[PDB]
Design an enzyme around this catalytic site. Structure first.
Site, PDB file in Angstrom:
ATOM      1  N   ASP A   1     -34.947   6.633 -11.279  1.00 12.25           N
ATOM      2  CA  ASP A   1     -36.351   6.988 -11.117  1.00 12.25           C
ATOM      3  C   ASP A   1     -36.344   8.158 -10.123  1.00 12.25           C
ATOM      4  OD1 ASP A   1     -39.059   7.212 -10.468  1.00 12.25           O
ATOM      5  OD2 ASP A   1     -39.138   5.217  -9.547  1.00 12.25           O
TER       6      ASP A   1
ATOM      7  N   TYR B   1     -50.221  19.588 -10.780  1.00 14.84           N
ATOM      8  CA  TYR B   1     -48.987  19.998 -11.507  1.00 14.84           C
ATOM      9  C   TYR B   1     -48.672  21.458 -11.194  1.00 14.84           C
ATOM     10  CZ  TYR B   1     -46.242  21.827 -15.478  1.00 14.84           C
ATOM     11  OH  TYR B   1     -45.365  22.519 -16.241  1.00 14.84           O
TER      12      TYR B   1
END
Length: 240
Positions: free
Chosen positions: A63, A156
């Site tokens: 992860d 983002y």
């Protein structure tokens, strides 16, 4: 021949651009590849595929939001191969949100995967490059959105701008080490079409290989669009 003898870590490599990149690297003679991602099954499948192309492949289940997982990736290259030559930061998240409705959790995941993970993968790769006197090459996969970008992906876009700044900062800091750090700033991936990851991989290979010579700190736009160019200046249709 181009990557003969080279050991590479490539993130985002259970599918999509990272897998395309790993496949190309193997096709061009990479000795050893460390790939990584969330899916054990896809990871195992890609590794066996890389071995059939000629590369020893190690898969690391991770992860990337977890900095210790980031560190383990690069540790695994050392464990398996005893050295590192290339890092390709191709993983990324593309979670959406406007300035008005983005949650802190969403903001934090974007920065964690798009900015922090590269930071700490880069940290670890440069420690190996220095230890073994390697003229390492790092390729960050950033975005055409990194200058400002689109309202539907505010956090983002900021995470990618941070990455571009980091590309330049790191490149500068290791200039005398002959460790090269460059960015490929891509459009959206699969006239006007979504980008083909196999062709994007080719640009990455250039930047990861001797063919790009001393190049470092470059922000290379890769898309059918051009920053600051347009027929009429863009603006929203409506107030936010």
């Amino acid at each position: 021949g181009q990557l003969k003898g080279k050991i590479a870590v490539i993130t985002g490599s259970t599918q999509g651009l990272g897998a395309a990149t790993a496949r190309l690297f193997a096709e061009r003679g990479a000795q050893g590849l460390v790939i990584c991602g969330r899916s054990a099954e896809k990871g195992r499948a890609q590794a066996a595929g890389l071995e059939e192309l000629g590369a020893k492949a190690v898969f690391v289940q991770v992860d990337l939001e977890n900095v210790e997982d980031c560190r383990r990736i690069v540790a695994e290259a050392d464990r398996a191969f005893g050295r590192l030559d290339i890092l390709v930061n191709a993983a990324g998240l593309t979670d959406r949100g406007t300035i008005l409705d983005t949650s802190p959790e969403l903001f934090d995941r974007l920065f964690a995967v798009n900015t922090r993970a590269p930071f700490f993968l880069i940290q670890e790769a440069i420690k190996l490059f220095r230890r073994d006197r390697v003229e390492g090459a790092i390729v960050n996969v950033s975005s055409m959105s990194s200058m400002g970008g689109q309202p539907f992906i505010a956090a983002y876009c900021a995470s990618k701008g941070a990455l571009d700044t980091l590309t330049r900062n790191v490149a500068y800091s290791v200039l005398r080490n002959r460790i090269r750090v460059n960015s490929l700033n891509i459009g959206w991936m699969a006239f006007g079409r979504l980008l083909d990851p196999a062709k994007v991989a080719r640009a990455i290979a250039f930047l990861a290989s001797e063919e790009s010579g001393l190049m470092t700190g470059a922000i290379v736009n890769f898309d059918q669009s051009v920053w600051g160019a347009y027929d009429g200046s863009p603006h929203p249709e409506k107030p936010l």
